Design a protein around this ligand. Sequence first.
Ligand SMILES: O=C1Cc2ccccc2/C1=C\c1ccc2c(c1C(=O)O)OCO2
Ligand SMILES: O=C1Cc2ccccc2/C1=C\c1ccc2c(c1C(=O)O)OCO2
Ligand SMILES: O=C1Cc2ccccc2/C1=C\c1ccc2c(c1C(=O)O)OCO2
Ligand SMILES: O=C1Cc2ccccc2/C1=C\c1ccc2c(c1C(=O)O)OCO2
Lengths: 151, 150
Amino acid sequence: SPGIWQLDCTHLEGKVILVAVHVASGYIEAEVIPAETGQETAYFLLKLAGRWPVKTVHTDNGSNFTSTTVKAACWWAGIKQEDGIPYNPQSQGVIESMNKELKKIIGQVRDQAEHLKTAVQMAVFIHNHKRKGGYSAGERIVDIIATDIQT
Amino acid sequence: SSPGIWQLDCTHLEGKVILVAVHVASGYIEAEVIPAETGQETAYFLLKLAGRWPVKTVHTDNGSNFTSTTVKAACWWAGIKQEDGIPYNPQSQGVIESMNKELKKIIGQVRDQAEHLKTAVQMAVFIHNHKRKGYSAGERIVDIIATDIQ
Ligand SMILES: O=C1Cc2ccccc2/C1=C\c1ccc2c(c1C(=O)O)OCO2
Ligand SMILES: O=C1Cc2ccccc2/C1=C\c1ccc2c(c1C(=O)O)OCO2
Ligand SMILES: O=C1Cc2ccccc2/C1=C\c1ccc2c(c1C(=O)O)OCO2
Ligand SMILES: O=C1Cc2ccccc2/C1=C\c1ccc2c(c1C(=O)O)OCO2
């Protein structure tokens, strides 16, 4: 469970925002891409798994589930690729809520940056630092993974 | 003071620039390929970093990025103390130089498995961070920051 991530893809300004959520903590990484292809998704997972211990990924849709490039990246990085089917239905709502939160932050900083990608990274910054402890998502992920290392 | 300190490091390969941030206390890195090191690239890269780890201090890699107003804007935004990168401890220039070689060596060993340099560079970041030294850099940074919170 310290190793489970969920991929999430949302839209804004006719661009695509790919998001990985660390399910246990709510911590995210996100990027702007021109379209969600297998190649983007695979490259994004390679980045994530080099930066956090990614054991399992719940892919956002069936195309990325099926994608050969995605499977190659998952194999390369040691990731157990899974579907992202909400066998707990509160899953669709939690994600939908995140997407709305993120878009609201992106809107609040909209003005401080010329490009959408800068706004998105500002929104990642704010989401990850936001106090619940009240511990933030960033503190939780570190706490979860550190606990896990000492066992 | 050590859990928040990062060092910027810029190196070259295949006519492109590899921008690296090293968590000084753990050796853990993030890195990107850019067409050229500009203030804007450096500022955007720092914004990314500080959204993903608690970045308190950055030692910039050179005086241009030290001076750059875009880099100062991103440091301000993200709450980062921008410092110089003067190796007051000389054991620094040597540690950074070794890393760059280690990275290029890893990039060379994977270079065949990916069409693009960016992919090879992220493979290298993956290999460096996971390498057992037997704790890894990725293990160390989590333990350093966890200890700090608690
Ligand atoms: O003006 C500000 C304040 C600020 C605070 C934090 C980060 C960036 C910026 C910033 C501009 C900017 C800078 C670099 C970029 C970039 C943009 C942008 O305007 O989108 O796009 C890609 O690299
Ligand atoms: O530990 C981590 C991992 C991480 C990853 C990304 C962002 C923050 C953090 C983080 C901690 C943290 C969190 C929120 C904060 C904050 C701190 C902090 O510096 O302790 O101070 C302001 O709001
Ligand atoms: O073939 C493989 C094996 C592999 C293992 C891990 C990650 C990528 C790849 C990969 C290809 C690839 C995929 C996406 C990319 C990308 C490349 C590339 O070939 O550089 O460049 C940008 O997005
Ligand atoms: O805890 C962290 C943070 C982190 C950030 C980035 C990469 C790895 C890790 C990491 C741990 C880890 C490290 C090396 C390994 C390894 C593990 C692991 O999965 O625990 O298993 C194989 O070599």
